[PDB]
Amino acid sequence: DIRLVKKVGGTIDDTEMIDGVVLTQTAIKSAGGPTRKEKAKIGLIQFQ
């Protein structure tokens, strides 16, 4: 259940615990989509 995400760079002191799910994958941004959404409902798409 515990998920440990690794990111290159930084210092060990910067390690901290997050109160929610951390997404390792990154957005697309090729079409210029908003990277920050406040009070949003996160969905899951198993189709294509």
């Binding site: 760079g9 930084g10 210092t11 002191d13 090729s30 079409a31 210029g32």
Partner: protein, 550 residues
Amino acid sequence: MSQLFNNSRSDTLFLGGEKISGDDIRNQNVLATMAVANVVKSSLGPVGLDKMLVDDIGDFTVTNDGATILSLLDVQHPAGKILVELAQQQDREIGDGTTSVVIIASELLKRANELVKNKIHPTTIITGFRVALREAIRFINEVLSTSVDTLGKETLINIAKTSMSSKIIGADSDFFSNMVVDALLAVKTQNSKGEIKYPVKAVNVLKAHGKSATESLLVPGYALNCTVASQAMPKRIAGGNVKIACLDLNLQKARMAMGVQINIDDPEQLEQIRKREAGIVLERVKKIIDAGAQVVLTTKGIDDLCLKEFVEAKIMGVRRCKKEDLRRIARATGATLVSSMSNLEGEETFESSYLGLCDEVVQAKFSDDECILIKGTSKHSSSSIILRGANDYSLDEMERSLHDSLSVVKRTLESGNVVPGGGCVEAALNIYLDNFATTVGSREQLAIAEFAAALLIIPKTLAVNAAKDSSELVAKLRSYHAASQMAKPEDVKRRSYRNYGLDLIRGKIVDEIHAGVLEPTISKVKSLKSALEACVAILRIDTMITVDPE
């Protein structure tokens, strides 16, 4: 420093290369550390000199940045890759202190290895470095100086000249100072609900060799490097409110989706189907021309089929360019980048809100290269710098010289507190840690005392490359700093010293405030933290094990 190699024991067998243990590993770690350290020692400081590296194809690279030098060096030693990746981590995050963090971390390994032979345990040595670093950071916060009573941009101008030193632009740093400060202020944006941030690399760097470097023009706007599609198009747009169209859609003869196979039972349908293939593209370009767009930017190549209508309509066509370059054009001019042309309704349409606005769009020819100069943007301002030099190899150095100057000024406006440079902090941290550890003492006093003298490698290396007397300058840096540490904050005098020293040009001790040399506080922090992790990781290694490749 390793002789006789090592006797292979038959009772100890492992697949692959032999296993070496004991003091031989730490002796080879320092030997591999001093190998990459001696390369960046001569390149440090305004009196320093860079090195040249041949690529075996006849091309070379001339740069003063320690990150590029170490990046071109592929180290087969396992512990040697840490210092190589340390420079790539230094310029990526802070953007400054690349040569210093390699030299600081090198002296930390040389002194600690001599302490391991003293029989003190490495963890006690590491404990001494971490306790001394915690108090050293607190001393950095005490020497912070907030800019006050300064006239205009002189605060950022004097700080930008520090990064320009030691590089080919150091002699021209007087003229280049106003170009770097005005470049990052034009790209100023807003994010995080009120937080001010700056883009990296947003300022375009164009390479045209000719005239002189002091004549480099600063364009009040973004400049894009591309060649015009058709030579019959006008290279200069007259009149204000020039409309720029940023598009990701190429105009070309295109094949229908691979999942489609055309089967026709009549020969009469061959005329309309072949004509419609080119007619579908006409519907997209026709609505754009009718909107009055003067300049049309396109991410992908455009065939000559659609370039005919651009000549009759006096529209300037554009072909393949970098995707990240077209984003800042639409944001500056007000245009909206369109990945695929569509509307909420099921019918195709084009809105005038997707067109940018600027004062003019002109194409200037620098030497034999032609580039577009976009000046007077509407929505957001932009900037570009065209570097000029004698040869293309000097322009390659001026790019990294300009990129490093943009990172120092970027960290300057994020934190108003700055610290004096030129070996002043390294000399101040020495005495502060000398009186430190005297209260605790015991065994940890020796490991902390060596950490204070380890920071002395930076001010001593600067005096060696100047062909001057180092012992004369180092003895002065210890004279002014030591006596003033005990001062009481009244009766003045006192602490007015210790804030300056180590001027390499005149070889005298002068005030850094009147000189203008300054460094951001962000460059000092995280440099010793990254150098500590590089020192701790190598020091903790007793035995190196190498496995032969399959």
